[PDB]
């Protein structure tokens, strides 16, 4: 059993402190690692420590920022990560590490459930809204809803009267900490000059409501 505990939220350039609890002992005679995973991305090993070393071995790409430690009497394995940025937003896992230098075998046989840590420079901000305009049977038009925080936003078309062929895409999160999304309606090609299309955008956290004609 391994249990991570974290702060949930940390401000940019602050220090992230996590803890991993190892009930049932065995902390002293083992290696222990921190591993993380940004949303939508791959695993990254941060480093390991021995339960009594207290030797440590860190990912060189994070070295100046990382401190691992072991409190044998509280059975706690800890990570400090200084000067965080949005790149450090990830799920953080602790894992028991089997490490035999002699055979070059390093692997993680027991994992915690992991804790999400979110680093955000973003404050509430309302979006800009721009039109997305272009033999095929269909054409696509839409609205770009740019640079808002936080989620969510809603988008309907023609005041809710147009529902068929509507696709609102999940938002992207940019390195700025702000989101953008797009909503597009797929329409018969011949309908292009014979009908009008207005996206109705609502971003409630910023009291933002915009109607935009797309032509």
């Amino acid at each position: 059993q391994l249990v991570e505990s974290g702060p949930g939220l940390v401000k940019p350039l602050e220090t992230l402190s996590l803890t991993c609890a190892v009930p049932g002992g065995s902390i002293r005679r083992n290696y222990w690692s921190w591993i993380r995973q940004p949303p939508g991305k791959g695993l990254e090993w941060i480093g390991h420590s021995y339960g009594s070393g207290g030797s440590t071995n860190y990912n060189p790409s994070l070295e100046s920022r990382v401190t691992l430690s072991v409190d044998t009497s509280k059975n706690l394995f800890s990570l400090k990560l200084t000067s965080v940025t949005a790149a450090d937003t990830a799920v953080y896992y602790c894992a028991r590490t089997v490490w035999y230098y002699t055979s070059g075998t390093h692997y993680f046989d027991h994992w915690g459930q992991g804790v999400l840590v979110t680093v955000s420079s973003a404050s509430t901000k309302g979006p800009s809204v721009f039109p997305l305009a272009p033999s095929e049977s269909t054409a696509a038009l839409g609205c770009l809803v740019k640079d808002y925080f936080p989620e969510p936003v809603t988008v309907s078309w023609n005041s809710g009267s147009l529902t068929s062929g509507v696709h609102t895409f999940p938002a992207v999160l940019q390195s700025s900490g702000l989101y953008s999304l797009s909503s597009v309606v797929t329409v018969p090609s011949s309908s292009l000059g014979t009908q009008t299309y207005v996206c109705n955008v609502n971003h409630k956290p910023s009291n933002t409501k915009v109607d935009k004609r797309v032509e």
Binding site: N59, P60, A133, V184
Partner: protein
């Protein structure tokens, strides 16, 4: 870097292999481990010491390595196997654990479907504000894995690109989007931009011009 194919897939009942290609400083001298991460759980150890199974891992999973490259094989594919797989090995030069780039295993599903790609130029309105956001929308593709690359005058773009993870649509195909955030001056000073979407080894591109 341990290089895995982003997407491996086959019908239930079939067999698949997932490659993991390293270098002599890692896979060549080290034992290889594999991890299974069902969505959206923690990873679990599937294979350790290159070919060994922890208790409670089925004999349908099997591992080997040859030189600088490792492989995980799965037989009798079952819907529960659909998941991300990561290989891992110690690198004795860098003194670090290196995870592979990860493979989504898809248990098919429905037929393969190539993405429909729409690339929008920046609007006149955003341009008057001295900005140009290009918007590349990718929909109805299956398996739900794609690589997006942008070109500026045919040149690879390595700055200002942001692309979502793929998300399951109601029809169980997937959607994604990619945004290239520019100033109006960059847009106006190029002759073309393209969004190139690679899915299952084929590429679908769209191009816009100022």
């Amino acid at each position: 870097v341990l290089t895995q194919p982003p997407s491996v897939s086959a019908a239930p009942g079939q067999k698949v292999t997932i490659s993991c290609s390293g270098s002599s400083s890692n896979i060549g001298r080290s034992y290889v481990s594999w991890y299974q991460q069902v969505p959206g759980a923690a990873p679990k150890l599937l294979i350790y010491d290159t070919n060994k199974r922890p208790s409670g891992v089925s004999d349908r999973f099997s591992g080997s390595k040859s030189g600088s490259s490792a492989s995980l094989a799965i037989t009798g594919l079952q819907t529960g196997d659909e998941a991300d797989y990561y290989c891992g090995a110690w690198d004795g030069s860098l003194n670090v654990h290196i995870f592979g780039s990860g493979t989504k295993l898809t248990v098919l599903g429905q037929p393969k479907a190539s993405p429909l790609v729409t690339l929008f130029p920046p609007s006149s309105e955003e341009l008057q504000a001295n900005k140009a956001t290009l918007v590349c929308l990718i929909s109805d593709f299956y398996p739900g894995v794609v690589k997006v690359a942008w070109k500026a005058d045919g040149n690879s773009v390595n700055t200002g690109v942001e692309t979502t993870t793929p998300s399951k649509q109601s029809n169980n195909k997937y959607a994604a989007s990619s945004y290239l955030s520019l100033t109006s001056d960059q847009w106006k000073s190029h002759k073309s931009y393209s969004c190139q979407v690679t899915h299952e080894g084929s590429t679908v591109e769209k191009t816009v011009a100022p």
